Nucleic acid binder design. Structure first.
Lengths: 379, 76, 182
RNA sequence: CAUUGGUGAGCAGCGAAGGAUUUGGUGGAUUACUAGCUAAUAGCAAUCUAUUUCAAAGAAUUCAAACUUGGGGGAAUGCCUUGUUGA
RNA sequence: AUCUGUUUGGUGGAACCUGAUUAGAGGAAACUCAAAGAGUGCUAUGGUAUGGUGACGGAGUGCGCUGGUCAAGAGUGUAAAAGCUUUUUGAACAGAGAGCAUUUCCGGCAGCAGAGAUUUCAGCUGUU
RNA sequence: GUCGACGUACUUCAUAGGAUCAUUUCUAUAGGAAUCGUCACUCUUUGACUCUUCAAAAGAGCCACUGAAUCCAACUUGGUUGAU
């Protein structure tokens, strides 16, 4: 039977261990009794994934004991024999059998992947790719596995082509998940930032382009808005107008969180990216006017633009002319908006300018801070 | 189970009653009678060839795999 | 043994743990169940006696038919077996081979006689009544169930006196006389 | 009227800090009393086995050996017997 | 009604006959013991078991393999063509992990430095 | 006249075609259908046990000690402001 075959496959390792001074024959017999129990539990009916986990833990501690015994007796870090890789091969085989039998246990899949990544020198990139291929075919609608695949390929191999292909296939399978779009934008921004800093490194060693601009991330942004809106409508499909307004509000939050990612990206042209996203939101969506449909969100976007005109610049090195231009834009927006909207926008702008400059610098310390306090009192 | 049975049959095919059971087939009566007629005729040819080999001091022994061939165009 | 599958039965046609050819159909067990025979060897002792009868009958048959010796001995055997009660009739010579059975002898045992005499409802009841000391054949109490009753001896197979069975039947008919001890 | 029918309710009488049925277990007896163990003229009983082995004695059917079978007919092949063939 | 006696339903069940059965026929109790039958449920999965006995693995390279495109050749057709076929070759490109080879390097040590979760990890500089 | 011959009347004797089973594989036919080391559940049949009815009958017997059950008596508690 299968248990007998697997035990007879375990035999040559114990031949090697007895041949070296590492283990006594009785100790080998006790180890094989435990392995007999575990192999019977795996190959019988009524098994669980916990039996696989316990067997892997047992083999791991056997390997640790073997390492200590090889350090102590022979005074060598490792022998050149079968026994130093055979337990590792067995643990990989137990993981493979467990994933084949219960493919739905994502924790066991993660344990398999972590183990195969951890034994880096002995494993193969081909093996990690095969485990990813099996797992991605079995669970194509799990976004985290696609993200982990792309992350492994980006940090370990720095394979930007494979990372792009992984993200594109994953978004083909999961077009409704905002998280995968976000990670794709983050990867592309990381790639172009690394290209920019690599060009800068070259320019300092020795002696434009839409790729360096960020138009790839902008196109991913636009396709994200269309696809996420369409799939959100398909999931939740006068009342249609209310649903469209709710969809626009839902997309607005993801857009603002993309804005926060752009603000996190300091090296990139934040002003360019914010200009593009506010251009998109200035363009009408869902057959309704944005400002008329969501005046609170329109006022929020106007205040966001007015603040981010100078928010990229530090408060210590703030430009009085830029602050005056922002205040003039705020006054124009207040004139355009309703009186309650103008009052709310003025209060928000005053609070933002206060938290920017008034807490940072004193009116006695800076002569321009007195003018800022006067402008805040006027607002 | 089937592979083990085949290997065991191959191992012990040489035994008397295993051979007896294994070679048994039901054969039509015409084919069986013609087989025994051909057996008798072959035995008669064998005794005639034995008499010829007794008469002739040196007769060539021709192979069963040679008997059917009258000739070849290109000689070897 | 579980039920054999089709391919197993072909290779195991002769296999049987419960019926063997030497058992002869469990004829002995059948006869002991019919007549409540307790001893195991009673059928085979009876069968040996039947075999002696049949061997003697075969030899008398191989004698010539118009032989005074043959005719006298066949009539002697027929009369003796009829007097014992093994043979119901004396008409035919061929009954000395056809109608001599173990069951014919077992029908002359005391419980079968009592059950035919309506003394007991079953042969097993008759067996128990014999072992419990209720039955006498003449003045003599018989507690052996294997005791064989002759045609003449049938007329004295009776309940013992002072028997609770005898008192019960007399009390049922309202004819119990306590001076007679019942 | 009878009830040698059932189920009950009550007297006389009997009558000592109760009475009446039923049932499990254990002990003694059920033949007529001379003690336990063993390798037994003795030793042991807390065993010994660190003397427990040597020597002596000891081999007929010249393997005789189913007194052991239900009855009637048989016996391909077994088995038994006898004869024969070749070693 | 010291009227009448048919019906319907209970109770009872002799004689004859008929059928079946026979250590007489049952009944009750169970997380009891035993012999079998039938039907279900359950990844129930080696068509030749795993990535490895330093007889090895990892990295790299060479060869091979795959796909479409382009060019050339050949066949067919034509008044020239176009078109079509190709078990013909070349080049560039995109690959797969899926074969083969290695007389390249790494699975010793010392030191530096970084990162990860005090240890670990690969890497660098030397040496063997 | 349990006699013959003849006449008459009566009684009884057919047979086939096909399939299956029977050889510890094969009943003679390729026109057919069966080769796997058990895990569990459900249902069903049967037999043991223990008790018992029809429904009895017989007690390996006697003493002693030691438990248990049941029915009365007595005592206790509840009960006509309601036991059964």
């Amino acid at each position: 039977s299968k248990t007998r075959y697997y035990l007879e496959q375990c035999i040559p390792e114990m031949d090697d261990l007895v041949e070296k001074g590492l283990f006594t024959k009785n100790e080998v017999s006790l180890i094989m009794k435990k392995r007999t129990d575990f192999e019977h539990r795996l190959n019988s009916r009524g098994s669980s994934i916990n039996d696989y986990i316990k067997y892997i833990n047992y083999e791991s501690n056997v390997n640790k004991l073997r390492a200590k015994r090889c350090k102590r007796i022979l005074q060598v870090k490792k022998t050149n024999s079968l026994s130093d890789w055979s337990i590792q091969q067995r643990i990989g085989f137990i993981y493979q059998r467990g994933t084949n039998k219960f493919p739905q246990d994502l924790k066991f899949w993660a344990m398999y992947l972590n183990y195969m990544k951890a034994r880096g020198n002995q494993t193969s990139y081909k093996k990690i790719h095969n485990i990813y291929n099996q797992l991605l075919k079995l669970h194509p609608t799990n976004v985290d596995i696609w993200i982990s695949c792309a992350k492994y390929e980006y940090e370990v191999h720095a394979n930007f082509k494979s990372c792009r292909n992984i993200f594109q296939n994953g978004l083909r399978f999961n077009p409704d998940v905002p998280k995968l779009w976000y990670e794709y934008v983050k990867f592309e921004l990381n790639f172009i930032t690394k290209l920019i800093n690599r060009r800068k490194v070259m320019g300092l060693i020795n002696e434009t382009n839409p790729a360096l601009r960020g138009d790839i991330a902008l196109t991913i942004f636009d396709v994200c808005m269309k696809t996420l809106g369409k799939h959100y409508i398909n999931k939740h499909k006068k009342m249609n107008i209310e649903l469209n307004k709710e969809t626009l509000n839902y997309l607005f939050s993801e857009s603002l969180r993309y804005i926060k990612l752009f603000d996190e990206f300091l090296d990139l042209e934040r002003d360019y990216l914010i200009n593009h996203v506010l251009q998109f939101w200035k363009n009408d969506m869902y057959d309704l006017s944005l400002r008329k449909d969501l005046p609170e969100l329109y006022l929020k976007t106007v205040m966001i633009d007015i603040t981010l005109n100078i928010r990229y610049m530090p408060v210590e090195k703030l430009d009085i002319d830029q602050l005056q231009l922002s205040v003039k834009k705020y006054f124009a927006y207040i004139s355009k908006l309703d009186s309650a909207s103008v009052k709310s926008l003025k209060n928000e702008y005053r609070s933002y300018l206060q938290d920017n400059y008034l807490k940072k610098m004193n009116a006695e310390d800076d002569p321009r801070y007195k003018i800022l306090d006067l402008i805040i009192s006027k607002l | 189970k089937l592979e083990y049975d085949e290997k065991l049959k191959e191992r012990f095919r040489h035994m008397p009653e295993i051979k007896r059971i294994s070679r048994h087939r039901h054969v039509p009566q015409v084919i069986k009678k013609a087989q025994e007629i051909k057996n008798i005729e072959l035995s008669s040819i064998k005794r005639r060839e034995a008499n010829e080999r007794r008469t002739r001091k040196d007769m060539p022994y021709i192979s069963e795999r040679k008997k059917q061939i009258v000739g070849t165009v290109h000689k070897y | 043994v579980r039920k054999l599958k089709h391919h197993e039965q072909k290779l195991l046609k002769k296999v049987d743990f419960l019926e063997w050819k030497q058992d002869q159909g469990h004829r002995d067990t059948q006869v002991m169940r019919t007549y409540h025979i307790q001893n195991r060897e009673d059928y085979h002792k009876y069968n040996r006696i039947c075999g002696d009868i049949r061997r003697l009958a075969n030899k008398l048959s191989l004698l010539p038919p118009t032989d005074p010796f043959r005719r006298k001995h066949e009539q002697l055997l027929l009369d003796k077996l009829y007097a014992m009660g093994v043979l119901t009739t004396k008409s035919k010579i061929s009954d000395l081979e056809n109608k001599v059975t173990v069951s014919a002898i077992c029908r002359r045992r005391l419980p079968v006689i009592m059950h035919r005499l309506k003394m007991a409802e079953t042969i097993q009841d008759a067996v128990k009544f014999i072992e419990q000391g209720h039955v006498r054949v003449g003045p003599n109490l018989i507690n052996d169930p294997a005791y064989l009753v002759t045609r003449n001896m049938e007329d004295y197979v009776t309940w013992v006196d002072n028997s609770k069975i005898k008192k019960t039947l007399l009390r049922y008919r309202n004819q119990i006389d306590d001076f007679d001890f019942s």
